[PDB]
Amino acid sequence: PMFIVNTNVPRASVPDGFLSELTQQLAQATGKPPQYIAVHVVPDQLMAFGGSSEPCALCSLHSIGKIGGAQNRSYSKLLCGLLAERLRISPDRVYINYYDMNAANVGWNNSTFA
Amino acid sequence: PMFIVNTNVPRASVPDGFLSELTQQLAQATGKPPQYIAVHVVPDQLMAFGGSSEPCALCSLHSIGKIGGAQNRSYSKLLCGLLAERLRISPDRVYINYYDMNAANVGWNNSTFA
Amino acid sequence: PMFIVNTNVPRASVPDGFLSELTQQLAQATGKPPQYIAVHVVPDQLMAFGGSSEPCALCSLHSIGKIGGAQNRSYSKLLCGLLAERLRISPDRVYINYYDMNAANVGWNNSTFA
Ligand SMILES: *C(=S)Nc1ccccc1
Ligand SMILES: *C(=S)Nc1ccccc1
Ligand SMILES: *C(=S)Nc1ccccc1
After folding, report:
1. Which terminus of chain C faces fewer neighbouring Cβ atoms within 10 Å, N or C?
2. How far, in Å, from the CA of B60 to the mean position of ligand 2?
3. Residue positions of the PTM N6-succinyllysine (chains A, B, C)?
4. Distance CA C98, CA A88 (A)
């Protein structure tokens, strides 16, 4: 799986260890090996949520399976919790788009996962 | 909707009020409350369109429904119009990817919209 | 088609000519005139792959059709090859998400491709 967070929170407000914590927590939540988890944090963005420039985030999670109603609710609780506790972003100012990728549509190591 | 614009136009050429204008115009265009709308503008990018580094944009619009042939043509006229007027980007150097998201695949406020 | 690369490799390590090379190589690979090809490279990113911040890349390729098992394997060999040669990123630290877009869901020039 891969997780991207885009936020208007400044770079200096992203704590040491944040990418490592995301990696560990995503491994735990998806049950997948941390070796293949990718994470990407993009601070200092020009963004608004509900017309307001208070702290917010727009995120994506891509996974080959492990995407669905109950799973995505669990991921949202986990990820909004992390964004609130580490970046001080209110959960009601976060969107996360979930993508269930077909293995044939994910490239890696000169080939695909199919 | 959530609207993201990535462009090689520099930050100083993005006019004051642009995020709010995008929010207002998308609210009016989708018939939705502005409290739902998220906007994200990413200037100063290293990009090319047709091999040329003249002003261009790569964009995404995500919505839970309200995505379809006629609706997407209307969004494109609106959004290319704003990019032309405000960022001086030719409409034939803009791509907008439209995504019809399922409510179960959009996280918000510790849960999803399902 | 549109190709986006997000990487932790620094801006100075992206060769002059890289966007033009990507455009030409993708034109040849997708069978499309280069006038339609968009490319976007995002260096200096805060990212990790497998918990490590060694060079890595997270990419996307969007196309109206011409996406599938064998085609995507060929794109992955091409694109991982270029990232390895030009940016010195190991192919096993690259993900490429492939998206088969419907023509009605791609805006361009005040309308869509439908
Ligand atoms: C998870 S091991 N990685 C992943 C899943 C889906 C798309 C890209 C990467
Ligand atoms: C477009 S109104 N944005 C949107 C719709 C539904 C849920 C969240 C955001
Ligand atoms: C290639 S003609 N351009 C393209 C394909 C898919 C989505 C956006 C742009």
Report:
1. C
2. 14
3. 77
4. 33
Q: What approach was used to elucidate this structure? A: X-ray
B33 within 8 A of A58, measured Cβ to Cβ: no
- Token pair belonging to A18: 């944040």
| Beta-carbon contacts of residue B113 (< 8 Å; ≥ 6 apart) | B64, B103, B104, B106
Residue of C nearest to B50 (CA): C35
| Apex A82 CA angle, A44 and A68, nearest 5 | 105
| Option in C43, C104, C109 nearest B80 (CB) | C109
Contact C106, C63 (CB under 8 A): no
Rounded CA separation C93/C51 (Å): 11
Cα C1 from Cα C99, distance rounded (Å):
10
Cβ pair C27, C37 in contact under 8 A: yes
Distance of alpha carbon C94 from alpha carbon B64, whole angstroms: 30
Beta strands in A24-113 (DSSP E): 38-42, 46-49, 57-63, 94-100, 106-108, 111-112
- Domains by residue range for chain A, with CATH: 1-114 (3.30.429.10)
Resolution (A): 1.4
Query: Is the CB of B110 inside 8 Å of chain A's CB atoms?
Result: yes
The upper half-sphere exposure of residue A109, i.e. CA atoms within 13 Å in the direction of its Cβ, equals 4
Q: Locate the chain B residue with the closest alpha carbon to C40.
A: B47
Q: What are phi and psi of A4, to 5 degrees?
A: -125, 135
Neighbours of C54 (CB within 10 A): 11
Q: How many CB atoms lie within 10 A of CB C21?
A: 14
For B49, B77, C57, C60, the CA distances from B72, given in Å and listed in that order, are 21, 9, 31, 22
Q: How far is CA C64 from CA B19, C17, C79, in A?
A: 29, 26, 18
